Amino acid sequence: GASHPEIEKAQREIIEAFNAKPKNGINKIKEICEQYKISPNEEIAEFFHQQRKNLDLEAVGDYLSSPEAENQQVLKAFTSQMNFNGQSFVEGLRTFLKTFKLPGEAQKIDRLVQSFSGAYFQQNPDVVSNADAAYLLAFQTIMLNTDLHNPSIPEKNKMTVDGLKRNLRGGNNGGDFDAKFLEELYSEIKAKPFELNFVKTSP
Numbered sequence: 097g098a099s100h101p102e103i104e105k106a107q108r109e110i111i112e113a114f115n116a117k118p119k120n121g122i123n124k125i126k127e128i129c130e131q132y133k134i135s136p137n138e139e140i141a142e143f144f145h146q147q148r149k150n151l152d153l154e155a156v157g158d159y160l161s162s163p164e165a166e167n168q169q170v171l172k173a174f175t176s177q178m179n180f181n182g183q184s185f186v187e188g189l190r191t192f193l194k195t196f197k198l199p200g201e202a203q204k205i206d207r208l209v210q211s212f213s214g215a216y217f218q219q220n221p222d223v224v225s226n227a228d229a230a231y232l233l234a235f236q237t238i239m240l241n242t243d244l245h246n247p248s249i250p251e252k253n254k255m256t257v258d259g260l261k262r263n264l265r266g267g268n269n270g271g272d273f274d275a276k277f278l279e280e281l282y283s284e285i286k287a288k289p290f291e292l293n294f295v296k297t298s299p
Contacts, residue, residue, distance in 0.1 A: 097177065099142050102128050107147060115152045118159050137166070141173035153197040154295045160196070161204035171207070175215040185223065185277075186284035188216055189234055194291045199299040209234050223277075225269030232267045236260070237281065241290045257282045 103110070103125060114121025125143060129136040144156050160171045178195075180188040192212045198205060213230035216223075224230045244254055255263070257279050264273050 097142065097145065099146055100129070100132060100134055100139060102132055103139060103143060107143075110143065111147055111150050114155065118152075118155045122159070137169040138173045138177075140170045141177060144170075144174055145177060154199075154299075157196045157199055157208075157295065158204075158299060161199050161201070161207050163203075163207065168207070171211045172214070175211040176218065178215065180212075180216045180219040184280070184284060185216065185220075185233060186237065186281055186288075188212075189237055190288070190290055194293075196293070198292060198294045200294050200296075201299055204299070209238070224273075225271065229268045229273075232264070233273065233281075236264060237285055238290070240282070240285050244286050245289050 098104075099107075106124070106128060110121050110124050112121075113124055122140060125140050126136045129139050144151070144160070148156075159167060160174060162168075175192070178192065180192075183191070189212060192208075196208065198208075210227075210231060213234050214227045216234075217227045217230045220230075224233065240255060240260070243249065260282050261275055261278050264278060266272060
């Protein structure tokens with residue numbers, strides 16, 4: 097996990113530029129990558145991971161959740177660089193979400209979750225059948241995170257493990273998810289809510 101030596105040498109300029117105007121900092125990375133013949137997508141993704149403590153996290157989240165082709169490719173590279181193997185599905189989703197200063201936009205959050213589901217699958221082809229299955233599990237888990245912990249909701253109205261299994265029926269590429277796996281998932285989210293940090297009034 098390291099940036100190209102030239103990016104590393106120009107990090108200060110890239111950081112100041114990114115923080116004042118994201119696209120400018122990105123173009124600086126792209127210009128150096130062109131010069132040294134390297135893939136900018138992975139380079140930009142690596143920079144986000146490496147210089148996280150120095151960047152405008154809201155700007156990063158916004159850039160990574162954007163629909164543009166370049167942005168989408170950076171996100172793919174960014175998420176694939178994370179480790180989802182040897183860490184439960186719930187732990188993985190928790191970590192992924194905690195990485196961002198989430199944008200207050202459903203479409204943007206959805207693109208991030210989609211990126212996670214894709215990466216989770218590639219790293220755990222034995223746990224879920226495909227990306228779509230991982231996405232359904234993520235969606236369900238997120239809905240669980242909110243509903244199971246809402247104080248104004250009578251306990252008896254909350255989804256039970258039994259309910260979860262019925263709701264995920266045939267959601268693993270036509271097949272089902274192992275019952276014990278779902279019981280484990282339910283216990284994790286129920287015992288430990290997700291840590292979600294969303295941006296303010298203007299995302």
